[PDB]
Every structure is written in C-alpha cells, then in structure tokens.
Amino acid sequence: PWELTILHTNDVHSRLEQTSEDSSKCVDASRCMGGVARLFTKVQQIRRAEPNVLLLDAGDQYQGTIWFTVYKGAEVAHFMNALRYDAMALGNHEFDNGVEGLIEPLLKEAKFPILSANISASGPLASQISGLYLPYKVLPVGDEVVGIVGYTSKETPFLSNPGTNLVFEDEITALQPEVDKLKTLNVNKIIALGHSGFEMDKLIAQKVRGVDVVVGGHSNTFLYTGNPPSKEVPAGKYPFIVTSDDGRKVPVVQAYAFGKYLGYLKIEFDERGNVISSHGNPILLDSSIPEDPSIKADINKWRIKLDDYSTQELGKTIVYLDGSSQSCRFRECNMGNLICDAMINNNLRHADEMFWNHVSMCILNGGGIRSPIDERNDGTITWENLAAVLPFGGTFDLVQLKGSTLKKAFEHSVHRYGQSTGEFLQVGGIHVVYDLSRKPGDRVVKLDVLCTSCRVPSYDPLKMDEVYKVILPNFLANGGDGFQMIKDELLRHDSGDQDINVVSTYISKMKVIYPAVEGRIKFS
Amino acid sequence: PWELTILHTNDVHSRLEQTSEDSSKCVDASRCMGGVARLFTKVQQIRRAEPNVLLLDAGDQYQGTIWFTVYKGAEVAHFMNALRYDAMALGNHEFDNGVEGLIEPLLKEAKFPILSANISASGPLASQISGLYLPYKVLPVGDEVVGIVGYTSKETPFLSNPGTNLVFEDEITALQPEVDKLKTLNVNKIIALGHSGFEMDKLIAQKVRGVDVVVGGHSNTFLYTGNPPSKEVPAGKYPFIVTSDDGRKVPVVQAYAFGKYLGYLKIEFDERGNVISSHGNPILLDSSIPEDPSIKADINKWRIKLDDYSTQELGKTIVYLDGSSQSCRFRECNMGNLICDAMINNNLRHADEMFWNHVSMCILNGGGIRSPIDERNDGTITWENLAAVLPFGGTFDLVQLKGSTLKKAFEHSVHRYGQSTGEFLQVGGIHVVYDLSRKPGDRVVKLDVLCTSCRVPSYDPLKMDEVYKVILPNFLANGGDGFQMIKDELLRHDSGDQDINVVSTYISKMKVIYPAVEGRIKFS
Ligand SMILES: O=C(O)[C@H]1O[C@@H](Oc2cc3oc(-c4ccccc4)cc(=O)c3c(O)c2O)[C@H](O)[C@@H](O)[C@@H]1O
Ligand SMILES: O=C(O)[C@H]1O[C@@H](Oc2cc3oc(-c4ccccc4)cc(=O)c3c(O)c2O)[C@H](O)[C@@H](O)[C@@H]1O
Ligand SMILES: [Ca+2]
Ligand SMILES: [Ca+2]
Ligand SMILES: [Cl-]
Ligand SMILES: [Cl-]
Ligand SMILES: [Zn+2]
Ligand SMILES: [Zn+2]
Ligand SMILES: [Zn+2]
Ligand SMILES: [Zn+2]
C-alpha cells in the first residue's frame, strides 16, 4: 500500500498568534493554544517522520483579528508560505475585500496553488484572473501524484463581497467533470478540498464519483474519534465515513477552526488509487508543543504595526457612546444601536430585484457590550477603545430563525428583568415593546420588523411562521446567555466578520457618528 | 463737495447665471434677471458716467448653485476679478469648505482685498493666513482715499465650517479701534463693509464712532425708497438712516440677495470727510439691461463642466427613494427621511461640552418633494436626479422657534388632511403622532423631540415655552404653504446651504444609502 498523510487546517480566521482556549486573546501564555509558530513546530515534526505528506488549507484564512484588518491578506501569504502549504481552497471570507483584495495580495503572492472549481468570471475580470486560482492541481508526492480539486460555498455572494462578475456554481455539478478529467489523465488519487460546510462535504463524498477523500471547512466542524482532548464536542467520528453512490467508503474530515487543531489523516491506497484504510484525529495545538522560535520572532516583528494601528484614530463620535451595563442591560442604549447598525451595514450584499438587502435585522445581548466610549478625547475612537467594548474576539454571524423563535428570544431578553443580566437585547431593524407587568414569557406586546422583500424598507408585525435572517453574535448563535432556543431552532448559521472589525469599518466609513436612543425598545 | 458712488452686492450666493424672478433657474430668458454678465453691463455703464466709483461685495458669494459645488470658489475669484470689484467682506458662507476652501481658491486668487476685522487665528494657521484677509484697506479714489473696514458675523461657527482655530470677535469691539486707527492715519472717509445682518449693521452705524456708511448683508435685506420695482417688499427706506451716538446721520444699505439688484448709493462728503447727503436705490437687473456678450460667452464655457458633472454618479441607493406625492403628502416617506437626515448632517458644527450638536431637528413640507428616484439604474443617483426632487433652488435654513410655534406647525401639517396638499411635514429628530378623528388644530397627540443639550441623544416631549433650533426650507421660513406662524413667530433665521447640494453631499459621503420608513410619523 501507498500511505499518504494529509495535514489540514480550515477557518483559521486570522489566528496568527496563539490564543486562549476559546480562541480569543491569549492572556495566560503557559495555557495558550494554536498560532502559526506552534503549527510550524508540529508540521515540521510530522514531516520528519512521514514520507508522503500534504499540508492543505480548506479556506477562510481571511478575516478574524487585527492582523487581517491591517495586513489584508499579506500576512496569510507570508505565513502560509513559511509553513510551505501544498494547496489551499478559496473560502467565503477570501472575498471580504472584493476580488481585488484576493488577487492582491493572496493570489499573486502565494507560492502554492489556490483552488476552486465552481467559481467562474466574466467580462474583463475573466482575463484578469485567469490562472490565478485553478479548478485543481496535480501534485507530486513521493513517486506518485495526487489530484486536489477545490470548491467554494455557492452561498458566498450572501456571505462576503465577491462582486457581480463572479458566479458560484453548484459544487457537485462543477466538481464532477473535473474529477472525470483527472481520471482520463491517469490521476487515480483525488482529494476534494473545499469550503462549503460539513453537510455539503458529505453530499460531495456521496455523489462526486472518484473523490477519495473530502477535506472541508466553513462550518467549524469538530470531528473526533475517542475522548476529546479539549472543550469542543464532536459532531461525529474522525474521519466521518460516507458510503458513496459508487459503493466506496469515503472519509470526510474537518478540523474545527481558529488554528486550535491540526487535522491529521492517514490514508492507505492500493495501486489503483482505491482507499484501503483511513484513520486519524485532529491534534490539539496546546502548550506542550513549543512555538517555533523563528516563526515567533517574525510574528513579533509583524506585531509592531498592529500595536501602532490600535491607537490610531479610526473616526470621531460627537456623542457619548453609552455602553454602560446600567443602560445596555436595562433599556435601549446608543452603543447598542451603533453596533447593530454597523452589523447591518457589514451585511449589505448585492441584491437582485427581490429585496433591497437580504438582511435587515440585528440582535445583540447587552452582556456583550463591555464598556462605554467617552467623546471628550477630541471625539477620537481607536481600535483599543473598541476592544474594550467588544473584548471577546467574537464574530457577528448570520442566522435564519422562525419568527416564533425570535419571539421566544425577546421573551427570554426580559424574563427576569431587573437584575442586570446579560440577556437583554439591543436591536437593529426591530421595534419591540414590552409590558413588564405581564407574566414572564408573555411580556412582548409588540414586535415589528423591517422588511427585506420590499423596495422601501418599512416595519411590519413579526409573523410567527416566517423565517427571518438575523445578524447576531456567535455567542448567541451558540446558545449563550440562556438563548437555547436560538441554538436549538435556527435553520441556517454562517459565521461572520470579527466583531471589532465590523464596528471599526462602519466608524471609518461614517467618519463622524452620533447614534441616538430612538425608541427601538419601549416599555408600556 | 466730493461725491462718491458706492455700488454694492451681497449674498449673491452662486447666482453666476441669470435667474428667474424668484432667483431660481432661468426658464423664460426674455424675463430673466441678474447674473454676472448683466451686472457687468450695468457696472460698466455707471463707471463711464461717474468719476468716483467703488464696487463692493458684503460677502456670501459662496454657496447656492451647482457652480459652487463644482468650482468651489474659483468661479467667484474669476468672475469678481472680471467685474473688477474693489473690495469684498468675508461672509459666513465663505467658510463652508473650511479655512482651506477659502484660502484656495478665493484668498489666493482675488485681485482685490478681502476684509474682516473681527476674525483672528491662532496656532500654525495664524502664520498661514496672515495678510490674506485684512481688517481694512485704504483705497485711492480719484484724488482722495477711502478706508473700508470689514466685519463678519460672530455667529459664523454656527452657520458654516470655519474650524476651531479661528475666533469671531464681537463686531463693534473689533471695529472701533481699526476705525480710530484710520483716523490717526488721516483717512476721514470710512465705509464699514460686512456680513452680520441688517440689525447688527444698524448697531454698527449707531455705535462705531467714525463710520460714515455701513454696507451690509447676510439677512438678504431689501431696502427701497419709493415704489418697489419687483416682488420684494422693502424692510425700510434706502438708505436706512441711523442717528449715531456722536450725533451724525449714518446711511445703512443692503441689496437683497442672489444678484437680482445692484445697490447704488451716492454720498456727498465735505473736505473733513463728513457725509453731507446720501441718496440712492438698488437697481433691478432685469432683461432691459443686456448681458455683456464676453462675460456671457465665458459663463457658457464654464457651464460645460457643470453639465458634465450633473450626470455623474454621486452615490448609490439600494432602496427606492419614494418622493411620490401619494406618500410624502399623506405619511412618512423615505425620501423625506433622507432629506431631513441630510439636513441635520449638513448642520453638524463644532460643539463645546454643552451639546452634542447645536441642532437636532428638521421639518420639510411634502410639497417640497417633487419626484421619487428609482434605484433600478444600477442604484445610481446623479445631481440631475436630485434636481427633479428639489427643483426650486431653495436653501435649508436654520431657525429658532418656540415649541408652541412648532406645535402650531404640526397642527397646520394635518389641518385639512386628505386632500394631497403640500403642507404635510416630513421630519428628522422629531417623532409625532396624530389623531385625525380630533378637531383640526387639536390633532397632535404626541410630539417628541431629540435633545441637543445632552451627551446621549434621546427623545423627550416638546415643551411649549422652550426655543428649538430647527432646519427647514427657506420656503417655510418665509411662510409658504400656509405656515404663517413660522414666519410670524420665529426668533432667529439664518439662510443655509442649497437644497440639492445638502442632499448631494450627504449621498456622496454615505456612498450607499438605504433610508427606511421607521415611525417618525404615526397615526392613532
Ligand atoms: O461577566 C459578567 O459581568 C456578565 O457575564 C455575562 O456573560 C457573558 C459571557 C460572555 O462570554 C463570551 C466569551 C467569554 C470568554 C471567551 C470567549 C467568549 C462572549 C460574550 O459575548 C459573553 C457575553 O456576551 C455575556 O453576557 C452574564 O450574562 C452576566 O450575568 C454577567 O454579569
Ligand atoms: O404645485 C403643486 O402641485 C403643489 O404646490 C404646492 O406649493 C408649493 C410651492 C412651492 O414653490 C416654491 C418656489 C416656487 C417658485 C419659485 C421658487 C420657489 C418652493 C417650494 O418648496 C414650494 C413647495 O414646497 C410647495 O408645496 C401646494 O402646497 C400644493 O397644494 C400644490 O398641489
Ligand atoms: Ca481513487
Ligand atoms: Ca468721516
Ligand atoms: Cl454544514
Ligand atoms: Cl438681521
Ligand atoms: Zn470560516
Ligand atoms: Zn466560511
Ligand atoms: Zn447669505
Ligand atoms: Zn450670510
């Protein structure tokens, strides 16, 4: 048998530095995890021991911390080059800065192929981008070759800013002929590497004839075989075995997110390229693995500009930004309004004639707002100020919730009102009225929401059976602050941009802000 | 006696081209008025006949039409140079584009002195601007000399964007020592030329010892002796005689606005510089006076860039901009919201610790909104589109009104509701609820207004005795659409920026707009 070791990362999301266990800022270094310097160590160790190794990334290196804000992808090229990645698939977040922000710096600077078989361009862009990403790449490994075919979420236009000159084709439709082509070229070992989520990965494994292994991402899916090593709870075994339509067993892998783990899969192939066996597990990148000193030193050098950036003026406020708990856990607060307005602005995507924008609504728990910002420093707002407001390193995600669920969420928001608890909701694109004299669970007396399928945005009563797109913190999507109904009942969930970055971008764009309290939340 | 002819303009406000009788776009040329080409004709004729002539401008050449939007003052320098103005005083609107937008192009390009004795600078700006404007200029006239001392509204920081490195001193305090100084230099004929309004002009005439004549502006004051020649109703005789504290008679003049009239005052002086007699009248620049062909031709050349500019993309809307009468005369409309939001944004001025901004409130009659804008042209908005919405060439002015007055205005807004009349009010910084089943004059059942004297903007009930700053169209400040209570009861009124320009600037700054209908106006 010919044995291949697939090392893989996905959804690293700008975690260049080691992080806390929850992937936020590293505070207690002796317990920190991940980061590229530690990843280097581990990959180097594995490559000393195993002869046939591929190191693959399944997309969404872009977006997640101040590294991406400042270096805009140059950090991704530079550090992925230094780890000698073999291939990367394009993720949705690779389009956050438009096509132009992908082409430079990542496509032009990567020393490894960047792949997606289901993205096509038209017009002058097609000529501009031709060959800068590829449907697949055939790589030599030992004395053999392995074909790697890429794919990207067809929902990318709703989840990033790819523009109107790129078309995201159905993955399976686009992949099959590329895999068929590889077979006619005598390439019998084929990895599908891509960025559409675990559920699509399993459909790819099932339906794309000739794929031997699927390496995925997007959904931040943790898979494990055995006792998990940290706090992440597995969605299934590693690898997850799919029985293909052609009758074969096809492993499917992912490795959570944020660079906390290195996916490690060993595949045995016969001479005809059939998978005989597959076994492995993600490897927790904890502090027992030393950070590579050279990589670390480079990271420390690159940090200097980040530190400088963090105290620069982003924009001005002429109003006090009231992020006090005495306000934001009790009533509409203007910091809440600002943040939810920035969340909707961040989620303006191209729309056809069906809607003015695909999403209009935002919720934000008051417990997520951790500081005010005083306007008396010549009105300046810096990233450092914003990091005090939003200190947890979270994202502002897009979910779909039935109106019933959202009504439950607002009843939860005030179920034990008066105790300064974190669940009280700040809003955008929603007007709510509470009557606190009613019984808990029956306190929402009006709930109106801004339409999307309309040419003129206006408010109408929430409908219990209708599904609404809502932007909200990943902390709430995951059931935090007691919002178990959101976790348990949501119909779709895609991770969004970094919290601080969302707000900082909105402030920069607006230049001078003046959020008011305006009656989004009232009490009878 | 030595006889001087003072020709004077004020508040020309970018009326480079001849205009209609109401100073809007010229439609029927054979009846149009004003413009610099006609002004040239008349000034040239007067200078052929009278030996001792000064041509003076009392400020506010800046701001008013697309000429200023595009040429930013270069048109003012160029055309004022071509008419060979002798001096100009700085107006409030000369600071609309900041100090930098005054220095270049106007101060650096004018071939005549630009004056103000009550503006001082500090810091690096003092060295930058030194001598580019002057407190006064002594001009030779025939074999004599005349001193001209300038002044500018001390309210300029509330009425434009002069920045924080200029201090606007009380006019009388600043003027007296400059006039005293001129007397010690043997200059016994002194004109005060400046831009503070007719009421301050009269106080200057009364209190500044040694001023022989006051030539003013700002208040767009029409003075006439006899039967008026057009539709403007005189505020008093021309000149208006003030009896000075030193016992002399001091003429005070102004000449309306918009270049419709040329002020013409003949002063006889004795050998000691005392005014023996003063008589005159503004001259209506109607079509009986031909436009100078060379000036006209130059104006036509300069127009080309204006025409080109008018169809360029200013920004995008992703929503339909509903400026239909069926909406805006009946209920809250999103075009209304947009325009009032642009009005408040235009009126952000520097604030001390007393208020987040000096003004928070806007009203706009639905009758002032004359077209929607469709978002289906790739979302583009052009100046030409905006000119369809706001076709009258008006301004968005700042007034002070008691809450009682404003309540009367909102009762008027719905007094005969249901007939598609123009008086229905669109709002910003105000939330109103009507009950149309109540009797006319008693239909306003709630009226809440956004605070100014607060660090966090929020809404509180209107107070009948409190005075509120409000931004609104000059058409309403003048009692249009039946709002006689606004005209009759307002406590202060200063003219603002051009309507179209206000909106175009806000759109350009925002880039992508999406105004909603959000409950600013409701019905019980
Ligand atoms: O610590 C506090 O003072 C308050 O903490 C609140 O809990 C939260 C914890 C939270 O923890 C995280 C989090 C924490 C550690 C690492 C990563 C993420 C993110 C949040 O947005 C978050 C939040 O929004 C909360 O409201 C509780 O609701 C509240 O009862 C408590 O007072
Ligand atoms: O002409 C119409 O269709 C409507 O005209 C309305 O009157 C207005 C006239 C107006 O005239 C001017 C104006 C007109 C000519 C020259 C300069 C300015 C400016 C306005 O904003 C303005 C306005 O806002 C109005 O509502 C009346 O309220 C309304 O009854 C009528 O239907
Ligand atoms: Ca195979
Ligand atoms: Ca005198
Ligand atoms: Cl999924
Ligand atoms: Cl006045
Ligand atoms: Zn991701
Ligand atoms: Zn993704
Ligand atoms: Zn003026
Ligand atoms: Zn003025």
From Swiss-Prot, chains A, B:
Q: Name one GO biological process term.
A: calcium ion homeostasis
* MF GO annotations: 5'-deoxynucleotidase activity; 5'-nucleotidase activity; GMP 5'-nucleotidase activity; identical protein binding; IMP 5'-nucleotidase activity; nucleotide binding; thymidylate 5'-phosphatase activity; zinc ion binding
Report the EC number(s), separated by commas if there are several. 3.1.3.35, 3.1.3.5, 3.1.3.89, 3.1.3.91
* Activity regulation (record text): Inhibited by adenosine 5'-(alpha,beta-methylene)-diphosphate (AMPCP).
The UniProt record gives the binding positions of Zn(2+) 1 as 11, 13, 60
Principal location class: membrane
- Per the record, what is one GO cellular component? membrane
Q: Where does IMP bind?
A: 329, 365, 370, 392, 475, 481
Residues carrying the lipid (GPI-anchor amidated serine) are 524
Oligomeric state and partners? Homodimer.
Cited function: Catalyzes the hydrolysis of nucleotide monophosphates, releasing inorganic phosphate and the corresponding nucleoside, with AMP being the preferred substrate. Shows a preference for ribonucleotide monophosphates over their equivalent deoxyribose forms. Other substrates include IMP, UMP, GMP, CMP, dAMP, dCMP, dTMP, NAD and NMN.
Question: What is the similarity comment for this entry?
Answer: Belongs to the 5'-nucleotidase family.
State the name under which the record lists this protein. Answer: 5'-nucleotidase
Which gene does this sequence derive from?
A: NT5E
